[PDB]
Amino acid sequence: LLTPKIVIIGAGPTGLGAAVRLTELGYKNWHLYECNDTPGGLSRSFLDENGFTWDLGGHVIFSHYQYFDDVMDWAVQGWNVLQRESWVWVRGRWVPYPFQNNIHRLPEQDRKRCLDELVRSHARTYTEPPNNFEESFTRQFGEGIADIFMRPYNFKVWAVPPCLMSTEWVEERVAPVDLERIRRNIQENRDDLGWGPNATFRFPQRGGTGIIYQAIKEKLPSEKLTFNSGFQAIAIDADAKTITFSNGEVVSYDYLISTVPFDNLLRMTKGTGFKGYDEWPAIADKMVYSSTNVIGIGVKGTPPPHLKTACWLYFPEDTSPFYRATVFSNYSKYNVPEGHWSLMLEVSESKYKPVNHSTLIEDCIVGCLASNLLLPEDLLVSKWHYRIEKGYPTPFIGRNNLLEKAQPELMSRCIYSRGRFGAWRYEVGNQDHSFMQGVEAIDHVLGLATEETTVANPGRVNGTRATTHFGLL
């Protein structure tokens, strides 16, 4: 009776993060609402008619937090730990990831060009920092690496011209180069391997990453969770402190942990005394994102020799519509029926880059044949396609300024908008980040913590590993 009623909207990792922290604390006065039947949001998994396990782009787990690792161990027994083997298909070669560090694997002419332009851009200095991502990577890597990889690959994944993107999200995503190391790589044909936070990752033996959140759902108190299409939140009244759902039910909260898209939130949230309130519709309109198409191809037999131990593959060239392919069957044999393997292809989509959905599956197959993934004789089963409206929250120029206009106003009225699209911060938009934003929001609501470091300070969380444990393990 004395504790605040905490309501969580969304059973993705962020929402489930909040629910797990509350459960760990033995907190009783909360409830979680989800409009889908399945927990896990963008990290959910599917099982098809033919025994193929699929998900939304071949998710792998790589945690920045001891807490989240403990939760993984608690929720799921039976993990595979893999060494990342990732490649770029470009100029007819398999270039080890990251592209920019491994230009010695390009054909001679392209390698020379890449090296020469890197030397050239090193020779050019500038009074002001780059104003955008394209200016940044062009100055940093030179015109060779920009033209061959950065420019075409980035438009291909983001579906937004990179000159419209900010430059501060890149810390753990875009690897730097060192001219001396590259020259030596070229003399020795020495691959530069191991860079990045996912150089090692873990993957559940059965059920994909989505089994994590299905297991978590099972471990939480059933009467505190609602999974039902009628419980899609469609209006928030911040004065009354109520949520109205599509089925017409109205419920109260003292605190709201919202994980719905930030633009959706702004559009459906009413109240008085919000500073800047009448700007909210224009703010919502300015939030840039790409949609994501996932295509699953089930294949009879076993992968060809070059893909035997591959994880994921990058495709900058226009001979394929997908920016990435994942050999999902290499993450776990239980992902496919006996005697098969599988590819998962991702194709980005936006107003800048429209997609013809009626030909999408066939176009991907043509892409696979032209990109060394499939052969004409391959026998395909379980062709599958799924489209996600909000796939990547683009780190567009001005993003922070926009978030700063409204987020503090929402928080002052006990509304915490968190998660991949809840907070719209790509650089802390993976599963561990999201889950932890949920955990940290709960700590902040309950006064157990002064700050929410993940959502507020991406530099700090991605530079250190958080040490603190999860009690239930």
Ligand X SMILES: Cc1cc2nc3c(=O)[nH]c(=O)nc-3n(C[C@H](O)[C@H](O)[C@H](O)COP(=O)(O)OP(=O)(O)OC[C@H]3O[C@@H](n4cnc5c(N)ncnc54)[C@H](O)[C@@H]3O)c2cc1C
Ligand Y SMILES: O=c1ccn([C@@H]2O[C@H](COP(=O)(O)OP(=O)(O)O)[C@@H](O)[C@H]2O)c(=O)[nH]1
**Could you say which of 8, 20, 23, 33 contacts ligand X (CB under 6 A)?**
33
Hey, how many other C-beta atoms are within 10 angstroms of the C-beta on 135?
Answer: 16
Q: What is the Cα–Cα distance from 253 to 136, expressed in whole angstroms?
A: 45
Choice from 30, 99, 280, 328 touching ligand Y (CB under 6 A): 99
Is residue 238 within 8 A of residue 271, CB to CB? The reply is: yes
Minimum distance from residue 383 beta carbon to ligand X (Å): 18
User: Can you say how many angstroms the Cα of residue 467 is from the centroid of all Cα atoms in its chain?
Assistant: 23
Question: Which range binds ligand Y by CB under 6 A, 66-74, 97-105, 259-267, 374-382?
Answer: 97-105
Q: Which of 15, 68, 172, 173 is nearest to 432 (CA)?
A: 68
Q: State which residue, 143 or 263, has the beta carbon closest to ligand X.
A: 263
Q: Is 100 annotated as a binding residue?
A: yes
CA distance 431 to 318: 30
Question: Among 120, 173, 206, 465, which residue interacts with ligand Y (rule: CB under 6 A)?
Answer: 173
Identify the CA nearest to 454 among candidates 415, 422, 417, 425.
425
Q: Which does 336 bind (CB under 5 to 8 A by kind): ligand X, ligand Y, none?
A: none
Asked if residue 145 binds ligand X (CB under 6 A), the reply is no
Choice from 75, 90, 157, 455 touching ligand Y (CB under 6 A): 157
Q: What is the Cα–Cα distance from 111 to 226, expressed in whole angstroms?
A: 56
Among 63, 100, 185, 342, indicate the residue that binds ligand Y (CB under 6 A).
100
* Closer by beta carbon to ligand X, 316 or else 429: 429
Residue 232, marked binder: no
Chosen residue from 63, 154, 291, 348 binding ligand Y by CB under 6 A:
154
* Number of chain positions touching ligand Y (CB under 6 A): 11
Give Cα 1 distance to the centre of its chain: 39
Instruction: Judge whether 431 is annotated as a binding position.
Output: yes
**Least distance from ligand Y to the Cβ atom of residue 319, Å:** 18
Question: Are 6 and 29 in contact, with CB atoms under 8 Å apart?
Answer: yes
Which of 98, 298, 321, 422 binds ligand Y (CB under 6 A)? It is: 98
239: burial class by Cβ within 10 Å (0-12, 13-18, 19+)? exposed
For ligand X, the closer CB: 106 or 160: 160
Q: Figure out which of the listed residues 12, 96, 144, 208 binds ligand X, where binding follows CB under 6 A.
A: 12
Contacts of 280-287 spanning 24+ positions with Cβ under 8 A: 280/406, 283/402, 283/405, 283/406, 286/398, 286/402, 287/261, 287/262, 287/263, 287/393, 287/396, 287/399, 287/402, 287/424
The site string for ligand X over 397-426 (x = CB under 6 A, - otherwise) reads ----------------------xx-x----
Beta strands in 10-128 (DSSP E): 30-34, 45-47, 53-55, 79-83, 87-90, 93-96
Task: Write out the H or E segment, with its range, that includes residue 200.
Answer: strand 200-204
User: Residues in the chain, how many?
Assistant: 473
- Which of ligand X, ligand Y, none does residue 395 bind to, with CB < 5 to 8 Å depending on kind? none
Could you tell me which residues are annotated as the binding site for FAD? 14, 34, 42, 60, 233, 420, 429, 431
Q: Which residues lie near ligand X (CB under 6 A)?
A: 9-15, 33-36, 41-43, 56-57, 59-61, 232-233, 259-260, 292, 346, 388, 391, 419-420, 422, 429-432, 434
